[PDB]
Amino acid sequence: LRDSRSLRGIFSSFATGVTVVTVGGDSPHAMTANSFTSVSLDPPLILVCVECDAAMHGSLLEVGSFGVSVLAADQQHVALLYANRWRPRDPTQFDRPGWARGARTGAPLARGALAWFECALWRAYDAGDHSIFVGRLLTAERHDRRDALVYHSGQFRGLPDRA
Template sequence: MLENHRRALRGVLGSFATGITVLTAGRELPRGMTANSFTSVSLDPPLVLVCVLRTAALHDLVLDEKAFAVSVLAAGQEPIARRFADRARPRGAREFEAVDTEPGRRTGAPILSGALAWLECGLEAVYDGGDHSILLGAVLDAGRGPDTDALLFYGGAFHRLAPSTV
């Protein structure tokens, strides 16, 4: 696809508002990344999917560990979303510096403190998605955080919900 077509497609896809998550994996040397390609698949059995760029540092770690966690970000967590989207962020042990987390009970993957909700998943299947892998996760554990607004992504920028006028 030509670059100008990619830009146009990115603009079209940016017309769909999404929530923002940080995906994490790893007990010993965890990794994380910001993602908005997260969705529920099934309640019975409980399944979710996430799409991860094949060249992302998190990608192979999830495949090796066969587990990952999803933290759904709250409106006040935009700095965390930006941090884990920054390709120049510190790597290794410093990647989670100044970010409060707790290890997941089932996977050991970091769960972000203050997240609106979180899920721990076992890797159920991996599907080809072009330059991404589509990761199907079986939900092992899940919970909710503070009762607050969600962080949203729309039109290439972060937003929060506005009160309904209807």
């Protein structure tokens, strides 16, 4: 239980979709998250868990709102990039055609995603080495159903789906 590689392994038995959480503002940023969870319908709430030592932890608190893009299976590379701590953190990357801007927050939203969310930060709860960020939905939108990106047993997987 004290071993990270082992415990991460047990955790990996639970399959997930994959998202990219984003902020806009002066210093736009993006990161890959699979801790995304639908929480409540009234009021409409979701949550994500972000490492305390991660840059997005501070950005979320600074900006107070965020975007979420649920990734299709052909967006594995997007998932990989924004999980990469060594990545370019340059705001120019979000001006590329692969990004849309949320109508409500201006947060980057990944084109081709299965779905988009914009949220206002409702609360941030302590949770050990992570914090639980609860967002109240401002906008939400589902796109064409197609194969979904899935993360299971530490592997990226494609989940077939069609309307």
